[PDB]
Design a protein around this nucleic acid. Structure first.
Lengths: 235, 191, 91, 41, 67, 191, 74, 192
RNA sequence: UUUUUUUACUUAUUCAAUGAAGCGGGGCUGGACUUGCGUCCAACUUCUGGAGUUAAGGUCC
């Protein structure tokens, strides 16, 4: 049995009645200027008409193909500081016993990175696959890269994360990575990934990459225009 | 949502397990300590039944097993889900003294006194914790009774004390077969 | 309303009737499914037909799963038109 | 319903193409005032 | 590398892509302070040919002046 | 002078219902020919109550309850949007736009007459004290009645001292020297 | 190795040298391990066992009497 | 800050860097010692060895209790093994100096009274059984007490062994320990 | 493809207010017309110079 002295005291939150409860006012928060600036920058880029050379960066690899690309590319990460020091120690010992460094050091197969390096590789057609980060600021660094890869016949894909590519190449960020050569036990995997990129990204974005982006209205403007069209259709 | 790669991986795991179990069935006294570890998510009915009789449902459950032909066949069957080896006297003593629970009335009762052992196993001449340890370690005539009285040991995860490796399992699958005396390192770390 | 038939090819070893039904039941209800298998040995021939009850559900599944890289295989997922569906396809 | 079947198809397609981490937590703010957070001195 | 392409593209200031980038960046820099620090150059090829290096001790400051 | 004579800021309570205030004091504002009324409202969001300063309409008194909002009644001292009053109603401190807390019809014995409504575009035609016709948004507020202190200018000032006392707190230029009484370098009328 | 017993405040404040609070009723410092009496032996003397039994028995009688009194009051 | 760096390495996938940075953490689950060194605190809190010998009652009761507990996250298994090792070393000193005076079998445990340098030291040891960690105690603050007392007992053991002219720490045989030697796994020989 | 006219829009720019508090769109309930269920319009305090703030309570643990 409950205590008879316990009482229910409901509060009425109508106008002129009891004090309003504490609600979630996050939609109307007076944000700091940097937060407001970055949000309004994103919104302005959504509002304006985006030319196709910039708008094509909104189409990237999906989750499965990006995961397969990173599954291949994590086997070809560059040398670490400790690995390079150990290799240099072995080469120094080989020089001391009178052998060339190539006798104890084999040919390396690493992911090629660095924007000028990758651009030169594309120009000399040494690159077999190119992955371009979708969030490079300034965008002019990579805006010509799909056209360069299309002119030189190189398979490319736009991928999410310069930080994700930096994890591959032991950096904070990486604007672009390229695969030129892999080992013979991964040549079949590289060919399959290249064919998967060609069939599942490039053919699917062949028509959408030429279209203008942006031009999206806000929520209240969209509702106003829908109401206006409904009124015009009714009358 | 479940991925198609998960479906294909699960089929290949089940076909490998079926081939291995068929090979074991076609091919047809020491003390071992067995710890249940994380393995394949889908378990075939015969390994599931062997885990039923070995009381190895939850992860980090440990049991003592007398090595016979039937028990060796069971251990070989449930090898991908267990880590087993030969425990030493220190491991057996520390396990029974620090994590020792008995099964009286179907209940988990900690071994806080010799009276529990005397009224539950006194018909077999086991009247103290040291008598229980002697039966387990020397594998006496009443090893089955002693091991059935002993509740499965709940071993701890050392990775839980460090935040960057908080979700990591302590024992990684892949090192199949008998660990022999190297199970004692795991027992010392987790007990 | 009108059922929709999806033809899927380049299936890897492991994508069989149970896995196909379990995967595409997430997209929608499946009424019929078959895997092209040889009668001599019982092995699959890496092709299957899945007819869903619902046509744009089938279209959505086909557009999602087309050119999917799965275990070294790039899946093919097309929609069989109702004019070209065999009346004895799902025997 | 047809709309329910279509929504289920959209949800399955979205989970297949983008994953299952579709949602994000945001702070409930009972005030419209933002304060500079207190950091280590 | 890419900086030759950046120079050739920076020549085309009345093209659609450069005009769009100039418009959005003009709005952003008008929203920012009159003098403020830039984390990296917005024209890396121009900064590099004027003598900027990505080395500890080189900084970039952005400034607007009334014309 | 302590505070400007303004309405409450246009909030949710005035936009959708009504909020009650109590008139505590009717005070003299130096430099202004009309009295002011101090009115206390509740805060809908906190326990502390809010004191406002209105231009007092005639017939208002201390201890009187007044009501501000869309659903307020048509009584002297109440503050209503112009869409909530009929044609022919006179009002005081009429907002030019909804939310500027009062611009038109503020001095003693003055008012603004609601000539008409255009409900399709949400506009209201009003007549100003100078005789001008204006169109304002219908959500603009006004206080029902005529500003108190009317007939002030009927009494002659009769004395240079009374003019001096009037303009000393008003800061207006007094005494006024004629431009024709000046030199040609002082005024264009000089000479 | 290290063998001890052999601007920063190199001297401790006397507030640290102040003794900790004792929760004992007489206000004196309780030993960390109190000395056990004969009534706590595993095989105690009959007199000490009977003394402890009598004390705990009369305490139990008083506690149950108080509990029944409060139940009657309720 | 080091834990943040280890989390960054694990998130980026640098397993070797994560392991190398984890070696600098000095985790108790790996070392058997407290995460933070309290050696400077010991001298401040005990100005004299006589003060340490007077706090030995609480120290020995806590450490002899915790040598029989299961491994938790607060006190890991290697820490518990080190507590048992320190208790065994103290018992060996008492044996070789014949400093044990009285022993009592109570209903709560075994009381021991020894005399070290004219100070009476009384500590209580549980019977060898399963010990119940109830929720009415603050077990993590008990673990901090254990870390402090194990740091104190290490220095006390070193001072006593050096006073009686024995090398410290004593030789410990892991094979005999795994066979169950307990006290017998220690070999005491003279200094130099 | 371009030049003029008006004719809408919002994102540049401009103005105002606020402690950036309830904006826009749906749902629930009630009322009106309508077609035989779509709109719009309303929820909440008016005899009194009182008081109103630390959530009462419901339900799963």
């Amino acid at each position: 049995p409950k205590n008879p002295l316990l009482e229910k005291r409901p509060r009425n939150f109508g106008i002129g009645q009891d004090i309003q409860p504490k609600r979630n006012l996050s939609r109307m928060v007076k944000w700091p200027e940097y937060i407001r600036l970055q949000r309004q920058k994103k919104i302005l880029r959504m509002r304006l008409k985006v030319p196709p050379a910039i708008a094509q960066f909104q189409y990237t690899l999906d989750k499965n193909l990006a995961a397969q690309a990173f599954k291949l590319l994590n086997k070809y990460r560059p040398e670490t500081k400790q690995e390079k020091k150990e290799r240099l120690l072995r080469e120094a010992t080989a020089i001391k016993e009178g052998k060339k460094k190539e006798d104890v050091s084999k040919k390396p197969y690493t992911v090629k990175y660095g924007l000028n390096h990758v651009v030169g590789l594309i120009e000399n057609k040494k690159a077999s696959l190119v992955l371009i980060a979708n969030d490079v600021d300034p965008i002019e660094l990579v805006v010509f890269l799909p056209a360069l890869c299309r002119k030189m016949g190189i398979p490319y894909a736009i991928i999410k994360g310069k930080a994700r590519l930096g994890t591959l190449v032991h950096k904070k960020t990486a604007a672009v990575v390229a695969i030129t050569e892999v080992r013979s036990e991964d040549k079949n995997e590289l060919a399959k990934l290249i064919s998967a990129v060609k069939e599942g990204y490039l053919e699917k974005v062949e028509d959408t990459r030429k279209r203008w982006g942006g031009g999206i209205m806000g929520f209240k403007a969209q509702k106003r225009e829908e109401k206006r069209k409904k009124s015009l259709e009714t009358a | 949502f479940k991925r198609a790669e998960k479906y294909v991986k699960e089929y290949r795991e089940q076909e490998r397990e079926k081939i291995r179990l068929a090979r074991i069935a076609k091919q047809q006294a020491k003390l071992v300590f067995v710890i249940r570890i994380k393995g394949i998510n889908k378990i075939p009915p015969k390994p599931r039944k062997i885990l039923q009789l070995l009381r190895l449902r939850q992860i980090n459950n440990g049991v003592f097993v007398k090595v016979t032909k039937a028990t060796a066949e069971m251990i070989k069957i449930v090898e991908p889900w267990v880590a087993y080896g030969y425990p030493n006297l220190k491991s057996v003593r520390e396990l029974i003294y620090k994590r020792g629970y008995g099964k009286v009335n179907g209940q988990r009762i900690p071994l806080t006194d010799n009276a529990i052992i005397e009224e539950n196993l006194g018909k077999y001449g086991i009247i103290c914790i040291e008598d229980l340890i002697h039966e387990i370690f020397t594998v006496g005539p009443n090893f089955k009774q002693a091991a059935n009285f002993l509740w499965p040991f709940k071993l701890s995860n050392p990775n839980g004390g460090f935040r960057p490796r908080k979700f990591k399992h302590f024992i990684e699958g892949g090192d199949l077969g008998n660990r022999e005396e190297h199970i004692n390192a795991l027992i010392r770390a987790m007990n | 309303s009108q059922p929709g038939v999806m033809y899927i090819a380049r299936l890897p070893h492991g994508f069989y009737e149970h896995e196909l039904r379990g995967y595409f039941s997430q997209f929608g209800e499946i009424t019929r499914l078959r895997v092209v298998r040889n009668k001599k040995t019982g092995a699959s021939r890496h092709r299957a037909f899945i007819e869903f009850a619902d046509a744009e559900v089938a279209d959505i599944a086909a557009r999602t799963m087309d050119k999917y890289l799965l275990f070294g295989h790039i899946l093919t997922c097309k929609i069989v038109p109702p004019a070209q569906v065999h009346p004895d396809l799902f025997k | 319903s047809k709309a329910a079947k279509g929504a289920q198809a959209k949800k399955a397609a979205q989970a297949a193409l983008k994953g299952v981490h579709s949602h994000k937590k945001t702070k409930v703010r009972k005030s419209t005032t933002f304060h500079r957070p207190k950091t280590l001195v | 590398g890419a900086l030759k392409y950046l120079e050739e593209l920076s020549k085309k200031k009345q093209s659609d892509v450069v005009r769009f980038l100039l418009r959005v960046r003009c709005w952003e820099y008008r929203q920012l302070n009159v003098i403020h620090r830039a984390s990296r150059p917005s024209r890396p090829d121009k900064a590099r040919r004027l003598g900027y290096k990505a080395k500890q001790g080189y900084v970039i400051y952005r400034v607007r002046v009334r014309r | 002078r302590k505070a400007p004579a303004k309405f409450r800021p246009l909030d949710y309570a005035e936009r959708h219902g009504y909020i009650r205030g109590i008139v505590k004091e009717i005070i003299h504002d130096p430099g202004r020919g009309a009295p002011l009324a101090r009115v206390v409202f509740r805060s809908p969001y906190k326990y502390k109550q809010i004191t406002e300063t209105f231009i007092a309409n005639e017939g208002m008194y201390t201890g009187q309850f007044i009501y501000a909002g869309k659903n307020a009644a048509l009584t002297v001292g109440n503050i209503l949007p112009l869409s909530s009053v009929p044609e022919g109603t006179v009002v005081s401190n009429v907002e030019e736009k909804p939310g500027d807390r009062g611009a038109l019809g503020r001095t003693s014995g003055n008012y603004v007459t609601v000539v008409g409504h255009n409900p399709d575009e949400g506009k209201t035609r009003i007549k100003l004290p100078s005789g001008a016709k204006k169109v304002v948004p219908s959500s603009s507020r006004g206080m029902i009645g005529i500003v108190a202190g009317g007939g002030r200018t009927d009494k002659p000032l009769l004395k240079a001292s009374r003019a001096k006392h009037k303009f000393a707190v008003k800061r207006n230029r007094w005494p006024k020297t004629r431009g024709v009484a000046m030199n040609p370098v002082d005024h264009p009328h000089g000479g | 190795t290290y063998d001890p017993w052999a601007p920063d405040p190199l001297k401790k404040p006397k507030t640290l040298e102040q003794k900790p609070i004792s929760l004992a009723a007489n206000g004196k410092s309780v030993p960390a391990v109190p000395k056990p009496t004969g009534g706590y032996s595993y095989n105690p003397a009959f007199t000490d066992y009977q003394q402890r039994l009598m004390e705990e028995s009369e305490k139990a009688i008083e506690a149950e009497r108080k509990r029944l009194q409060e139940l009657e009051l309720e | 800050a080091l834990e943040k760096k280890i989390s960054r390495a694990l998130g980026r996938g640098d397993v070797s860097n994560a392991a190398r940075l984890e070696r600098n953490a000095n985790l108790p689950e790996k070392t058997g010692k407290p995460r933070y060194t309290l050696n400077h605190i010991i001298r401040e809190r005990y100005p004299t060895f006589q003060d340490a010998l007077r706090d030995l009652d609480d120290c020995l009761s806590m450490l002899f209790l915790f040598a029989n507990l299961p491994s938790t996250t607060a006190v890991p298994a290697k820490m518990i093994a080190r507590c048992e090792r320190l208790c065994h070393e103290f018992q060996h000193y008492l044996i070789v100096t014949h400093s044990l005076r009285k022993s009592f079998l109570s209903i709560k445990g075994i009381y021991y009274q020894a005399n070290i340098q004219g100070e009476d030291i009384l500590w209580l040891v549980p019977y060898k059984f399963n010990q119940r960690i109830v929720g009415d105690v603050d077990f993590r603050i008990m673990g901090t007490f254990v870390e402090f007392y194990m740091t104190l007992l290490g220095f006390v053991n070193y001072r006593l062994y050096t006073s009686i002219g024995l090398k410290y720490p004593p030789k410990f045989d892991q094979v005999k320990d795994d066979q169950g030697a307990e006290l017998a796994a220690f070999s005491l020989e003279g200094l130099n």
